[PDB]
Amino acid sequence: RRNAWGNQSYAELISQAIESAPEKRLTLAQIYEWMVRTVPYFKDKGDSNSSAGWKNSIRHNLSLHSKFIKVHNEATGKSSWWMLN
DNA sequence: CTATGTAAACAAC
DNA sequence: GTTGTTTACATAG
Ligand SMILES: [Mg+2]
Ligand SMILES: [Mg+2]
């Protein structure tokens, strides 16, 4: 294992999360939820705040890679939708 | 040198 | 306390 959760890179995990959504878009909190619900290593980490290393790494990847695109979200108290490409 | 993971400064909310 | 962008640095290859 390249990482504690497997060989997937964070970009690959985020990509799988987005692709699993029916409308192919998820908010940042939803990407974290997908990790906690689906990746064994993260199953006992839902109780963490945003300073958690892995959450910071997710945010870093979303901004760094052009493959992740940010779209405005109409829902009043919710953040941006993240999509692929 | 590049890809990747990790940490943190910093803005804006 | 979160969301988002960014620099900085470490290491594997
Ligand atoms: Mg991006
Ligand atoms: Mg060393």
Coordinates of all heavy atoms in Angstrom, one line a residue, chain A residues 61-70 82, chain C residues 5, ligand 1:
Chain A
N61 N -6.1 19.3 -3.3 CA -6.2 18.6 -4.6 C -7.3 19.2 -5.5 O -7.1 19.3 -6.7 CB -6.5 17.1 -4.5 CG -5.3 16.2 -4.3 OD1 -4.8 15.6 -5.3 ND2 -4.7 16.2 -3.1
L62 N -8.5 19.5 -4.9 CA -9.5 20.2 -5.6 C -9.1 21.5 -6.3 O -9.4 21.7 -7.5 CB -10.7 20.4 -4.7 CG -11.6 19.2 -4.3 CD1 -12.5 19.5 -3.2 CD2 -12.3 18.6 -5.5
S63 N -8.3 22.3 -5.6 CA -7.8 23.5 -6.2 C -6.6 23.4 -7.1 O -6.5 24.1 -8.1 CB -7.3 24.5 -5.1 OG -8.3 24.9 -4.2
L64 N -5.7 22.4 -6.8 CA -4.5 22.2 -7.6 C -4.8 21.7 -9.0 O -4.2 22.2 -10.0 CB -3.6 21.2 -6.9 CG -2.2 21.0 -7.5 CD1 -1.4 22.4 -7.3 CD2 -1.4 19.9 -6.7
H65 N -5.6 20.7 -9.1 CA -5.9 20.1 -10.4 C -7.0 20.7 -11.2 O -8.1 20.9 -10.7 CB -6.2 18.6 -10.2 CG -5.1 17.9 -9.4 ND1 -3.8 17.7 -9.8 CD2 -5.1 17.4 -8.1 CE1 -3.1 17.1 -8.9 NE2 -3.9 16.9 -7.8
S66 N -6.7 21.1 -12.4 CA -7.6 21.7 -13.3 C -8.8 20.8 -13.6 O -9.9 21.2 -14.0 CB -7.0 22.1 -14.6 OG -6.5 21.0 -15.3
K67 N -8.6 19.5 -13.5 CA -9.6 18.4 -13.8 C -10.8 18.6 -12.8 O -11.9 18.1 -13.1 CB -9.1 17.0 -13.7 CG -8.5 16.5 -12.4 CD -8.0 15.0 -12.5 CE -9.3 14.1 -12.7 NZ -9.0 12.6 -12.8
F68 N -10.7 19.3 -11.7 CA -11.8 19.5 -10.8 C -12.3 20.9 -11.0 O -11.5 21.9 -10.9 CB -11.4 19.3 -9.3 CG -10.9 17.9 -9.0 CD1 -9.6 17.7 -8.6 CD2 -11.7 16.8 -9.3 CE1 -9.1 16.4 -8.4 CE2 -11.2 15.5 -9.1 CZ -9.9 15.3 -8.6
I69 N -13.6 21.0 -11.3 CA -14.2 22.3 -11.6 C -15.2 22.7 -10.5 O -16.1 21.9 -10.2 CB -14.7 22.5 -13.0 CG1 -15.9 21.5 -13.3 CG2 -13.6 22.3 -14.1 CD1 -16.5 21.5 -14.6
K70 N -15.1 24.0 -10.1 CA -16.0 24.5 -9.1 C -17.2 25.2 -9.7 O -17.0 26.1 -10.6 CB -15.1 25.5 -8.3 CG -15.8 26.1 -7.1 CD -14.8 27.1 -6.4 CE -14.5 28.2 -7.3 NZ -13.6 29.2 -6.6
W82 N -18.6 20.6 -6.9 CA -17.4 20.2 -7.5 C -17.7 19.1 -8.6 O -18.4 18.2 -8.3 CB -16.4 19.6 -6.5 CG -15.8 20.7 -5.7 CD1 -16.2 21.1 -4.4 CD2 -14.7 21.6 -6.0 NE1 -15.4 22.2 -4.0 CE2 -14.5 22.5 -5.0 CE3 -13.9 21.7 -7.2 CZ2 -13.5 23.5 -5.0 CZ3 -12.9 22.6 -7.2 CH2 -12.7 23.5 -6.1
Chain C
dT5 P -10.7 27.2 -5.5 OP1 -11.1 27.9 -6.7 OP2 -10.4 25.8 -5.5 O5' -9.3 28.0 -5.0 C5' -9.4 29.4 -4.8 C4' -7.9 29.8 -4.4 O4' -7.6 29.4 -3.1 C3' -6.8 29.2 -5.3 O3' -6.1 30.3 -5.9 C2' -6.0 28.4 -4.4 C1' -6.3 29.0 -3.0 N1 -6.1 28.1 -1.8 C2 -5.4 28.5 -0.8 O2 -4.8 29.6 -0.7 N3 -5.3 27.7 0.3 C4 -5.9 26.4 0.4 O4 -5.7 25.7 1.4 C5 -6.6 26.0 -0.8 C7 -7.3 24.6 -0.8 C6 -6.8 26.9 -1.8
Ligands
MG1 MG -9.6 22.9 -9.6

